[PDB]
Amino acid sequence: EQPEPRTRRRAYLWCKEFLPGAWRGLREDEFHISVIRGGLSNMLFQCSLPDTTATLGDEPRKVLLRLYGAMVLESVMFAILAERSLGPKLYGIFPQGRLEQFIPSRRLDTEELSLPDISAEIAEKMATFHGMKMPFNKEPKWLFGTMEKYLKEVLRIKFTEESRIKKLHKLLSYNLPLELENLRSLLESTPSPVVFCHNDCQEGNILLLEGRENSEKQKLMLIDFEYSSYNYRGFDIGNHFCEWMYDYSYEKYPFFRANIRKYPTKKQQLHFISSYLPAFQDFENLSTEEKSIIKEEMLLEVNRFALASHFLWGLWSIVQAKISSIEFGYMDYAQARFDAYFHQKRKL
Amino acid sequence: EQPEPRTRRRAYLWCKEFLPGAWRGLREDEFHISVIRGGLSNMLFQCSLPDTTATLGDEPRKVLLRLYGAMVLESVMFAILAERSLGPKLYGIFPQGRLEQFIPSRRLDTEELSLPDISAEIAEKMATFHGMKMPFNKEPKWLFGTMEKYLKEVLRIKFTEESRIKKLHKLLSYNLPLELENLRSLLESTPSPVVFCHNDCQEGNILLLEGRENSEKQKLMLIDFEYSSYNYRGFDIGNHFCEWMYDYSYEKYPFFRANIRKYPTKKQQLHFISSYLPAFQDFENLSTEEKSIIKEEMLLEVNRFALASHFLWGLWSIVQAKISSIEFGYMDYAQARFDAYFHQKRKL
Ligand SMILES: c1ccc(C[n+]2ccc(N3CCCC3)cc2)cc1
Ligand SMILES: c1ccc(C[n+]2ccc(N3CCCC3)cc2)cc1
């Protein structure tokens, strides 16, 4: 798929001006670009030298253009992860977007999250992410700060369309401000270390790296850290466990499938935190008693913070139903997160 | 010097929230802060743990707070230089400023720039800076782009003070638009490689590192990359040579000294580019003949680009005389840069 002419022009000039070697002397007529993801927001394009053009130096042959269609924090963070080889390289930054390394890969599918070696490697990559120093606010205000902002916005919302009006009345009927305070009191009493969290560790943000599919422990990269913050570790892991239940590749309305039965079993959760803990702290030398206590208390921690994954994404999704024009059943998704919230409360 | 109460409060909270280990549990009453530089713009403060407080990990004991009083590019650049150990570590970033490693040091004095070992190390540090890949526009539009912006602003300016009105009329009498085109024709005929330039390599932006004063080749750090861009190498070197003539530490009006005789001699220029060239490009393995040809070519290049240092800082200084409330003789400095411009033209 070719982009619109204005985009091809701007993309050609960004590549020509920001990228070194063969890019600097490239003509408009030699520029290869194709759409990876369309939309009004966060469009992706592959940009490439001709197969016949030789590289002068170490410049890449293809790059990813990301157009926007908080910017400071996200840009600094992307640049830092690039310097530490924990993200794609940053080739160019300008007001309208970035040029990034193109990483030959695909996203994981929902069903791949439960494969033991995939799950063990996500746990190791998340533990690594959790351990790094970032120049951002270390006070864990992100979680309840964000839920309070969305709740405020949710209580102001008026839909005009019938089906959206009825769905919102059902969600509002739960008394979301009271439920939020009950959730705060539970998590206030749930110790969880503050770490640098991805905050959106789903299959769509996990690369299966082409040519590494036979590697047991090094075939993945976590990407798209735009929601990242210092946050309770319990949130990041609980949120990941929730994502086992949601498949965003469903091609008919509401453009997701939810399956409560797909949440990881205690066995699958122990397999994940058993990879996470050695990678985060050594831990393997502790007594079996201490290891068991730590794991059991961590299962409780992540399953409780899983409630905040449901609550935050539920509220987020109601706001998107108002402000987003993306083809997605936001209100149905909100209801699915709240069904899972009350089911998880009953399970606990 | 102690800051204002409001500032002490905000500084305490930034350090407490952004810095790890002992900072996280620090009380207001344990907070040590003192002013390094006042002003309406770019205030600096030292912030410190008590001498009695032990560090829990590898957190710093003291840090520099920088308050502002372009932001994306400058923040990403600072973060990248920190990651590569070419600038101070970045401990925190927020809308009002940054935290930053405290580097025990002082600035060089103008007179130190001509010390052979100081000059050789500035040349090596600038060569290193010139060699690095940065995610910025590589098209060298910065130099004439900036001079055209300042010239446009200079031609709009009306002063209300009589002495400033007369000083501007003399500067305007040179026919700055014609002189800019004479400069364009000279520099368009002068090859100079495009490199990542500091653009402001003066003594005030060169740290003498405390405890390294006996190191021959590693006692300096270049700082304050706020004006950095891809630019003609000739500008960065020519600009540095011009800064041998200007002392900004003079305590009486106009708060600088200018001395045309302090420009580096051919010998001192060859000493600098003799350190620069091996550190930038390999060059070491060329014959004596090839080295001499390249050096003589480079003396031409850098002395011509020196004219653009005079012209750009001259125009900049007229604009600052309008908009800046810093106590400095901006119009006298402008006249000094234009005197040096016409003197350098006559010399060439
Ligand atoms: C642009 C943005 C989003 C989509 C579709 N989509 C995919 C995943 C979505 N979610 C993942 C996080 C919870 C909701 C929401 C919407 C398609 C294009
Ligand atoms: C702090 C801030 C400003 C000043 C004085 N000053 C110093 C240097 C200036 N220049 C920057 C390099 C060329 C002109 C301009 C003004 C002195 C101390």
Side-chain angles (χ1 to χ4, degrees), chain A residues 2-5 7-8 11-40 42-61 63-70 72-88 90-123 125-132 134-148 150-151 154-155 157-165 167-187 189-213 215-250 253-256 258-283 285-348, chain B residues 2-5 7-8 11-40 42-61 63-70 72-88 90-123 125-132 134-148 150-151 154-155 157-165 167-187 189-213 215-250 253-256 258-283 285-348:
Chain A
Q2 301 303 301
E4 255 19 74
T7 291
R8 183 192 169 74
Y12 162 67
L13 259 169
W14 287 322
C15 288
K16 178 192 186 50
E17 290 201 327
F18 286 81
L19 306 174
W23 290 98
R24 298 285 303 107
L26 193 67
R27 304 193 313 274
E28 190 289 326
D29 63 84
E30 303 172 86
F31 186 61
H32 290 79
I33 180 165
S34 59
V35 179
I36 283 164
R37 180 173 80 218
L40 313 195
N42 243 71
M43 303 89 86
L44 297 178
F45 307 89
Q46 195 181 169
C47 305
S48 209
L49 299 181
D51 295 326
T52 60
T53 304
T55 57
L56 306 189
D58 66 344
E59 72 270 31
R61 300 199 56 88
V63 298
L64 185 73
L65 167 63
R66 167 185 314 262
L67 295 184
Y68 304 140
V72 172
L73 293 188
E74 198 283 335
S75 297
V76 166
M77 190 207 300
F78 191 92
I80 291 171
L81 294 187
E83 291 296 317
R84 301 187 182 167
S85 306
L86 295 169
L90 178 60
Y91 284 113
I93 184 163
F94 38 93
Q96 301 82 16
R98 311 194 271 258
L99 291 162
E100 297 178 15
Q101 187 186 359
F102 182 94
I103 303 184
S105 66
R106 61 161 179 88
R107 308 311 208 258
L108 296 186
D109 304 309
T110 310
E111 319 85 72
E112 292 177 300
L113 292 186
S114 56
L115 290 167
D117 291 356
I118 292 289
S119 190
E121 186 174 351
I122 295 166
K125 298 284 193 288
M126 177 171 309
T128 306
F129 204 103
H130 284 174
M132 64 195 168
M134 295 295 281
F136 306 133
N137 194 317
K138 288 168 192 62
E139 253 315 289
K141 66 191 73 173
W142 181 85
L143 180 55
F144 275 88
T146 307
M147 283 189 291
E148 286 161 13
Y150 297 153
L151 178 62
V154 162
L155 291 171
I157 283 172
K158 146 82 187 169
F159 293 117
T160 72
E161 192 276 320
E162 172 71 357
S163 79
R164 273 177 247 267
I165 285 174
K167 286 164 193 181
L168 178 58
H169 284 342
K170 182 173 177 162
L171 287 162
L172 251 24
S173 87
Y174 298 136
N175 193 347
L176 298 181
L178 178 53
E179 202 50 53
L180 180 50
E181 291 316 312
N182 296 343
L183 181 58
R184 187 193 307 277
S185 151
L186 177 67
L187 297 181
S189 79
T190 309
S192 190
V194 178
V195 295
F196 192 67
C197 289
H198 186 282
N199 289 330
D200 187 19
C201 185
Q202 59 145 300
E203 59 275 17
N205 294 328
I206 308 174
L207 292 185
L208 182 63
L209 295 179
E210 172 196 286
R212 290 199 188 172
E213 291 93 349
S215 171
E216 197 185 5
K217 300 188 216 270
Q218 296 300 333
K219 42 181 191 298
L220 310 178
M221 176 187 309
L222 313 185
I223 61 163
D224 287 8
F225 332 97
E226 47 244 61
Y227 293 114
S228 286
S229 68
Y230 279 98
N231 188 17
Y232 305 100
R233 158 185 83 190
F235 185 81
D236 221 12
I237 297 176
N239 180 71
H240 179 63
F241 292 176
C242 288
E243 282 294 349
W244 290 38
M245 297 188 299
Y246 303 113
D247 185 341
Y248 303 116
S249 72
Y250 186 45
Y253 182 92
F255 304 104
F256 73 89
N259 187 345
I260 196 76
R261 264 201 75 183
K262 287 297 191 188
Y263 196 78
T265 71
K266 171 169 168 165
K267 174 179 259 226
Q268 285 165 319
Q269 296 178 37
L270 281 170
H271 177 74
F272 181 99
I273 72 160
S274 287
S275 315
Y276 177 93
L277 282 168
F280 186 57
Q281 59 144 308
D282 147 25
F283 165 90
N285 296 329
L286 295 175
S287 52
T288 316
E289 274 91 351
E290 190 168 355
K291 285 198 228 154
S292 280
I293 288 173
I294 283 169
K295 284 178 185 187
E296 288 293 339
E297 183 179 342
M298 198 172 171
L299 289 178
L300 196 43
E301 171 197 352
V302 310
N303 280 293
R304 286 182 177 184
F305 271 92
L307 292 171
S309 180
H310 295 311
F311 210 96
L312 175 55
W313 287 101
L315 291 178
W316 174 89
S317 198
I318 303 175
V319 172
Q320 307 314 298
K322 181 63 191 177
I323 72 178
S324 174
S325 70
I326 292 170
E327 190 179 15
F328 189 82
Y330 284 112
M331 290 304 296
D332 290 358
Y333 185 67
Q335 183 60 56
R337 296 316 298 260
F338 279 105
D339 293 343
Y341 175 83
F342 288 117
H343 182 273
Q344 177 82 340
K345 281 183 66 167
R346 291 190 53 80
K347 196 163 81 178
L348 301 171
Chain B
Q2 303 296 291
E4 287 300 291
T7 289
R8 185 193 166 73
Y12 164 65
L13 288 193
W14 284 321
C15 289
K16 179 194 183 48
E17 291 196 342
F18 283 82
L19 306 173
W23 287 94
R24 296 287 305 110
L26 194 72
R27 303 193 314 273
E28 202 289 335
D29 64 84
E30 307 171 86
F31 186 60
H32 291 142
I33 179 164
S34 51
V35 180
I36 284 163
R37 178 172 81 217
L40 314 196
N42 244 74
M43 301 88 89
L44 294 180
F45 312 85
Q46 196 179 170
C47 307
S48 206
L49 295 188
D51 300 29
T52 61
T53 303
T55 59
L56 307 189
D58 62 350
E59 73 269 31
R61 303 198 56 88
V63 302
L64 182 73
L65 166 64
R66 166 187 315 262
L67 299 180
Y68 304 140
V72 163
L73 292 187
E74 200 280 338
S75 296
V76 168
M77 189 201 308
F78 192 93
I80 292 170
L81 292 194
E83 289 296 322
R84 300 183 182 169
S85 310
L86 296 168
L90 179 58
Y91 284 116
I93 184 173
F94 39 92
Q96 299 81 21
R98 313 193 271 256
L99 279 166
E100 302 190 25
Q101 184 184 4
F102 184 90
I103 305 185
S105 65
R106 61 159 177 95
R107 309 311 209 258
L108 295 188
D109 306 309
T110 311
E111 319 86 72
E112 292 174 302
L113 292 187
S114 55
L115 289 168
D117 290 1
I118 292 289
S119 185
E121 185 173 352
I122 293 166
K125 298 285 190 288
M126 172 170 311
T128 306
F129 204 103
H130 283 177
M132 64 196 170
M134 293 296 274
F136 306 133
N137 192 319
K138 288 175 194 57
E139 254 312 291
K141 65 188 81 166
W142 180 87
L143 179 55
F144 278 83
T146 309
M147 285 185 298
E148 289 161 13
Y150 296 158
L151 180 58
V154 159
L155 295 171
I157 279 181
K158 177 174 170 165
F159 292 113
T160 70
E161 214 278 10
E162 173 68 3
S163 71
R164 272 187 238 266
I165 288 170
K167 283 163 172 186
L168 176 61
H169 272 330
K170 181 185 180 168
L171 287 163
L172 252 23
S173 90
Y174 295 136
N175 191 350
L176 298 181
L178 175 62
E179 201 51 57
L180 178 54
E181 294 314 316
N182 294 341
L183 184 57
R184 191 187 310 273
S185 152
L186 177 66
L187 298 182
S189 78
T190 308
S192 188
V194 178
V195 297
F196 193 66
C197 286
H198 186 283
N199 290 326
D200 188 16
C201 187
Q202 54 146 301
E203 60 274 16
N205 294 329
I206 307 173
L207 293 182
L208 181 67
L209 295 177
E210 175 190 289
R212 286 271 206 74
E213 291 95 347
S215 172
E216 197 192 352
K217 293 176 216 272
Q218 299 298 334
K219 42 182 190 294
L220 310 178
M221 174 181 315
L222 305 193
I223 58 159
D224 285 11
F225 332 100
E226 81 201 68
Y227 293 118
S228 287
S229 68
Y230 277 96
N231 189 18
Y232 304 102
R233 158 186 86 187
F235 184 82
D236 224 12
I237 296 177
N239 184 68
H240 177 66
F241 291 176
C242 287
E243 282 293 350
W244 288 39
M245 296 188 298
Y246 304 113
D247 185 345
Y248 305 113
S249 72
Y250 185 47
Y253 183 91
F255 305 107
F256 75 90
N259 188 344
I260 195 79
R261 311 211 78 204
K262 285 301 196 206
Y263 196 75
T265 70
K266 184 189 175 175
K267 180 181 300 197
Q268 286 167 322
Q269 294 178 32
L270 281 171
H271 178 74
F272 181 99
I273 72 162
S274 286
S275 320
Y276 175 90
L277 280 171
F280 176 61
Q281 60 143 314
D282 148 24
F283 168 90
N285 294 325
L286 297 174
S287 49
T288 311
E289 273 89 357
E290 253 161 331
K291 285 181 186 189
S292 281
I293 290 175
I294 282 166
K295 284 167 180 194
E296 290 293 337
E297 249 175 16
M298 197 173 175
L299 290 178
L300 255 34
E301 172 196 355
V302 306
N303 280 292
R304 288 178 183 184
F305 273 90
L307 293 172
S309 178
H310 294 310
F311 206 92
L312 172 56
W313 287 103
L315 294 174
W316 172 88
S317 198
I318 302 169
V319 171
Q320 305 315 296
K322 185 61 196 210
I323 72 185
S324 174
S325 68
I326 294 164
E327 189 173 22
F328 188 83
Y330 284 109
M331 292 303 295
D332 292 356
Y333 183 68
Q335 183 59 53
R337 297 314 298 263
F338 283 104
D339 293 346
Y341 175 83
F342 288 114
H343 181 273
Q344 175 83 335
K345 281 187 58 164
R346 288 207 38 77
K347 203 169 78 172
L348 300 178

